[PDB]
Amino acid sequence: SGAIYVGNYRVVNRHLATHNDWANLVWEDSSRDLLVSSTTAQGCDTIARCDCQTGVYYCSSRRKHYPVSFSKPSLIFVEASEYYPARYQSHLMLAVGHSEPGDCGGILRCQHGVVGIVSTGGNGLVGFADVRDLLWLDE
Numbered sequence: 001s002g003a004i005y006v007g008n009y010r011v012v013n014r015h016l017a018t019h020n021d022w023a024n025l026v027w028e029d030s031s032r033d034l035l036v037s038s039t040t041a042q043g044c045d046t047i048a049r050c051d052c053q054t055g056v057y058y059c060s061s062r063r064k065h066y067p068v069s070f071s072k073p074s075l076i077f078v079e080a081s082e083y084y085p086a087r088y089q090s091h092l093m094l095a096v097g098h099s100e101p102g103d104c105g106g107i108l109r110c111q112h113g114v115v116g117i118v119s120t121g122g123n124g125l126v127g128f129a130d131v132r133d134l135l136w137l138d139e
């Protein structure tokens with residue numbers, strides 16, 4: 001579980017989006033596993049505008065925050081699931097670390113702010129969906 005709240009937007013994993021999320025849809029991308037919905041109230045998360053490759057992510061399966069070294073956003077192969085068949089997810093960042101399916105939503109953050117959210121995992125590699133390119137989240 002977990003979202004990013006910035007201004008009048010709510011950023012979630014598209015595979016965990018609610019009915020209300022789709023009823024107030026701003027933008028979605030299957031290939032990225034992202035969905036943005038509009039909010040009545042105002043969020044106050046700072047989205048990082050950077051090219052960092054180190055951060056700290058929240059892992060609900062361990063109730064801990066872990067420091068990781070992660071790859072630059074790219075097209076990584078992700079195996080089939082009940083939400084998507086076998087495909088190449090884009091804007092994906094991998095790091096060596098623990099993750100479980102319920103961990104999707106946990107924020108990854110650097111000194112500059114929010115980098116992305118947990119999206120994939122398995123084999124001791126946790127995958128984060130990048131959001132630093134979505135400049136429209138701030139205007």
Ligand SMILES: Cn1cc2c(CC(=O)N3CCC[C@H](C(N)=O)C3)cccc2n1
Nearest residue numbers: 033081099100101103104119120121122
């Ligand atoms: C965070 N996390 C998800 C895990 C899974 C499942 C997984 O990766 N996915 C299922 C949900 C949709 C995801 C996507 N974006 O396509 C793929 C299995 C083991 C460990 C995990 N750690």
Ligand SMILES: [Zn+2]
Nearest residue numbers: 050052110112
């Ligand atoms: Zn940064």
